[PDB]
Design a protein around this ligand. Structure first.
Ligand SMILES: [Pr+3]
Ligand SMILES: [Pr+3]
Ligand SMILES: [Pr+3]
Ligand SMILES: [Pr+3]
Lengths: 131, 131
């Protein structure tokens, strides 16, 4: 389990790209495997730390897709699970090559109340798009 | 205006692809040009009719991105404008190579009340994913 799941997550998080098909395929897999939410987020963050900015952005696209869709898919636990890593993660995507795309994601969450105001403020400060 | 706008829309709608950057770039342009919503939707539909299934799907991704984001961007008129074409458009993406991705988009709209129930029912019937 722990080993099988680690092997899948490594393969999937290494390879996620910027296509709708890549993102939605992996998002669906994550939501199917909601039982393992905490392990999923742990490996997502591991991959975010070890990646360079372009691949960090694709991992943020995956996170956004999961966070958005997990509610209608009866897997709202992912919102709480990702909140564990988002403040640290925001600071790893401050570079202007990617921060505007992440800032957009945070604005979408804010407008829809996906996370509360005070959490989004803390994330935008970490991104350096609000001071 | 009419000619300049037609030339931009042809170029942009021909070329939209399945990447987050392609979709978001064009979505932003559309929202910037909310004054021309009706012309934008007219050319979107023209391109949808003349395209094959794969490119029709990318045009639906663009439509979804506009429809979702136009509210926070003070351009909610696009939701009403796209409603003019969506029933016809749904029927042009019935092929199983793409209908599941479009059905997903319709489910996302339904869950969030982006459009009313009776409109979504009419769209899913046109897609042949509900009978
Ligand atoms: Pr390991
Ligand atoms: Pr490994
Ligand atoms: Pr013409
Ligand atoms: Pr032309």
């Amino acid at each position: 389990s722990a080993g099988a799941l680690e092997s899948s997550l490594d393969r999937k998080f290494q390879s996620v790209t910027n296509t709708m098909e890549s993102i939605q395929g992996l998002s669906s897999w994550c939501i199917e495997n909601k039982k393992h939410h905490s392990t999923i987020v742990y490996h997502w963050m591991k991959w975010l730390r070890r990646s360079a900015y372009p691949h960090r952005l694709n991992l943020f696209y995956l996170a956004n897709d999961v966070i958005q869709n997990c509610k209608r898919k009866n897997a709202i636990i992912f919102r709480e699970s990702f909140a564990d890593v988002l403040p640290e993660a925001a600071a790893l995507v401050k570079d202007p090559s990617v921060s505007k795309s992440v800032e957009r994601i945070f604005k979408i969450w804010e407008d829809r109340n996906v996370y509360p105001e005070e959490m989004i403020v803390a994330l935008r400060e970490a991104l350096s798009t609000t001071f």
